């Protein structure tokens, strides 16, 4: 019901850069062709972020709780589906009522309860010997769902279970904010084709859902799944292996950011108004090629 | 291009478009509006002719 | 037998301080210009007049159509709620949300709707409506307001500053009350924290006042947070119960399908005509636009900050809507002192 | 077509809603 | 706050500050009138009425 995972190796969290990532559509007004500004939370460019590996080669495995703030972006790197999904609580205890959204093998369940949460919840498919499939088989979550306000199931789709390689095949973007009890969740699912690193580019985020949760959110984990296979050694607490897959969180800041809108109407270039004086030049000019000459600033 | 720039500052409204606020709230609640944006308007263009 | 008409009259008074001339200031040009200068006397010149406006001749209300109907029978009126602490959380969309049936169903004390207009309801689109139902005592009915003291509206509720919705109280004493003491009904009064604007707590938990710890013991300094109420139909009018329902909705934001009993009619262009969509209403002429909005938008502005591109909430298409108002109009005149005639000319 | 010489001219040579004068017309700026 | 939990009152009106800024604020020659009237006659007690 209730257990922790043991052998593994621990790594230092290597921290890495990004490239222009952490641009949504705060505002639901289309644009084109027309220079705006706004006041959001967005993401610092070129700034610093955290990396957490997980390759199977001692092998590679870490389930941390981050706290949450005001907006928290998520960029999974994954090609044979290994984070699941994600748990927003503050205390873990029974005591306040925390949202679990989980991407089942068959439906995606979002139920907003108070969870009894283990000291390490995760899922586990195993690797049949007399049959090669895989199927679903550990939850070590939660131990029993009391008071229930919410619960979302979606509709059944396809889904292999099955590992495979040849370098990151999908990059997943989302995007968590917490307004007025309102859970904003926004998503963007993208076929890439990279060995590692950060994905180089620009993409602004659509909405996804507003779920009305309608309670306080100060700690995240990601759930995560394993793979057994038939030959694991001892019990199936200790034989499991890491996986094939990158994650990276980032914390959102309320920074001004100038936006160039092209004529399709979407969000092709963003510039953080508060980094550098010349970037606050930029934005104050309404500009992005100042030629020569001195200028005043704040 | 200030010129154009100026009308979509609200001037301490909630919009600058008067039909999205006489639809919302009545004449008598958007009338402080409308003559705040009527004197932040007329002070525009007084500085542009200026 | 002549039928008078709204016109902007120019008199003169003499002095003996009656009417001797007038001039019908909204016919000719000329009399446009006189009111224009404030004199009789006009110089040989040119002088600019308003803008060709083109008058309205049909006015659409595009909706989308709707199918159901809110109920209203088990929120206005219903037996059975909740505390407060706990309210009951309702999503009302996908039907027709009408205000007009609180005068002809149950007696309602207070009504107020904050942010909007009580006489708009019919009209707006709303989005996202919810419904917070709960039941409090008659005297913690004035702290239930966006911005309030008390252990009602720290503890138990929360309302936004600014907070754009419906908030609407009955009394309902013949209903949660009773003779040997109504005890169904709890709220919270010790706790160390606010709460969030639309925020939900069900905590149960032994609170820890003063410097004792309590850690479930139920003793000195360490009384309940949920204490019990005390209807019955023996006290007076400030103890009564009270069934307080919030309506929490958007105004203009994402495209939903609720709105109210407004529907679609017809769709007309290529002439100046009114068109209402979303509640927003707006005055031009609509064109075939080329370029398509976003899944997640409906309106679109510009540098000007104007509705620029609208969305049918019919066919998922998108119409660009242009001023009607275009030509500029001037007025040639050799002066009074020669002879009397004008000529019009269109820049 | 115009009475201009070589320098003349090159001195002179040398000198909805998404147009501009378009949308300048919509607020009464007239040229 | 040691108001709410031992009493109940009908009517708390706080003119030129609001209730919930009356906890970073100082008070300055605190002086307490109390009285009995009718309960129509609460509605006279505010700055300028008739």
Not at chain 1, 147 to 159: A, D, G, H, K, R
Not at chain 3, 103 to 116: E, I, L, P, Q, R
Not at chain 3, 216 to 233: H, K
Not at chain 4, 3 to 23: G, M, P, T, W, Y
Request: proline content about 5%; aromatic content about 12%; hydrophobic content about 35%.
């Amino acid at each position: 019901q209730c257990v922790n995972l043991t052998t593994r190796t621990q790594l230092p969290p290597a921290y890495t850069n990004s490239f222009t990532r952490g641009v949504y559509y705060p505002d639901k007004v289309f644009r084109s062709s027309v220079l705006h500004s706004t006041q959001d939370l967005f993401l610092p460019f070129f700034s610093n972020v955290t990396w957490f590996h997980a390759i199977h080669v001692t092998k590679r495995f870490d389930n941390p709780v981050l706290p949450f703030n005001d907006g928290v972006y998520f960029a999974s790197t994954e090609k044979s589906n290994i984070i699941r999904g994600w748990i927003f609580g503050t205390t873990l205890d029974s005591k306040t009522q925390s949202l679990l959204i989980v991407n089942n093998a068959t439906n995606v369940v979002i139920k907003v309860c108070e969870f009894q949460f283990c000291n390490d919840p995760f899922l586990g498919v195993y690797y049949h010997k007399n049959n090669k499939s895989w199927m679903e088989s550990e939850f070590r979550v939660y131990s029993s769902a009391n008071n229930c306000t919410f619960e979302y199931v979606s509709q059944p789709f396809l889904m292999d279970l099955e590992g495979k390689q040849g370098n990151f095949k999908n990059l997943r973007e989302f995007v968590f904010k917490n307004i007025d009890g309102y859970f904003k969740i926004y998503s963007k699912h993208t076929p890439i084709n990279l060995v590692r690193d950060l994905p180089q580019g620009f993409s602004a985020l659509e909405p996804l859902v507003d779920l009305p949760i309608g309670i306080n959110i100060t700690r995240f984990q990601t759930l995560l799944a394993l793979h057994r296979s038939y030959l694991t050694p001892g019990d199936s607490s200790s034989g499991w292996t890491a996986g094939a897959a990158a994650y990276y969180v980032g914390y959102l800041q309320p920074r001004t950011f100038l936006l160039k809108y092209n004529e399709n109407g979407t969000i092709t270039d963003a510039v953080d108004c508060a980094l550098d004086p010349l970037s606050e030049t930029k934005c104050t000019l309404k500009s992005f090629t100042v030629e020569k000459g001195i200028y005043q600033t704040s | 291009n200030t010129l154009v720039k100026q009308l979509s500052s609200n001037f301490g409204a909630i919009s600058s478009v008067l039909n999205d606020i006489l639809s919302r709230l009545d004449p008598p609640e958007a009338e402080v509006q409308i003559d705040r944006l009527i004197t932040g308007r007329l002070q525009s263009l007084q500085t542009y002719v200026t | 037998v002549g039928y008078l008409q709204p016109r902007t009259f120019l008199l003169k008074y003499n002095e003996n301080g009656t009417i001797t001339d007038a001039v019908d200031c909204a016919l000719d040009p000329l009399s446009e210009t006189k009111c224009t200068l404030k004199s009789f006397t006009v110089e040989k010149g040119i002088y600019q007049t308003s803008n060709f406006r083109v008058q309205p001749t049909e006015s659409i209300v595009r909706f989308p159509n709707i199918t159901n109907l809110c109920p209203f029978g088990e929120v206005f009126n219903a037996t059975r709620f909740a505390s407060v602490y706990a309210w009951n959380r309702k999503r009302i969309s996908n039907c027709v949300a009408d205000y007009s049936v609180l005068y002809n169903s149950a007696s309602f004390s207070t009504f107020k709707c904050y942010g909007v207009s009580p006489t708009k309801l019919n009209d707006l689109c709303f989005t996202n409506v919810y419904a917070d139902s709960f039941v409090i005592r008659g005297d913690e009915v004035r702290q239930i307001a966006p911005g309030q003291t008390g252990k009602i509206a720290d503890y138990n509720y929360k309302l936004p500053d600014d907070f754009t919705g419906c908030v609407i109280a009955w009394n309902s004493n013949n209903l949660d009350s009773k003779v040997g003491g109504n005890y169904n009904y709890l709220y919270r009064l010790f706790r160390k924290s606010n709460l969030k604007p639309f925020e939900r707590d069900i905590s149960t938990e032994i609170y820890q006042a003063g410097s004792t710890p309590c850690n479930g013991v139920e003793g000195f300094n360490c009384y309940f947070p949920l204490q019990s109420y005390g209807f019955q139909p023996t006290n007076g009018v400030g103890y009564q119960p009270y069934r307080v329902v919030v309506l929490s909705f958007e105004l203009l934001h994402a495209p939903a399908t609720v709105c109210g009993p407004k529907k679609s009619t017809n769709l007309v262009k290529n002439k100046c005509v009114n068109f209402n969509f979303n509640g927003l209403t707006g005055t031009g002429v609509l064109t075939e636009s080329n370029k398509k909005f976003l899944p997640f938008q409906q309106f679109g502005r510009d540098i000007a900050d104007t509705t620029d591109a609208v969305r049918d909430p019919q066919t998922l298409e998108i119409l660009d809507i242009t001023p009607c108002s275009f030509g500029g109009v001037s007025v040639i005149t050799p002066g009074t002192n020669t002879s009397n005639q004008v000529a019009v000319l269109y820049q | 077509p115009s009475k201009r010489s070589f320098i003349e001219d090159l001195l002179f040579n040398k000198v909805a809603a998404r147009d501009l004068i378009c949308a300048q017309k919509f607020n009464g700026l007239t040229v």
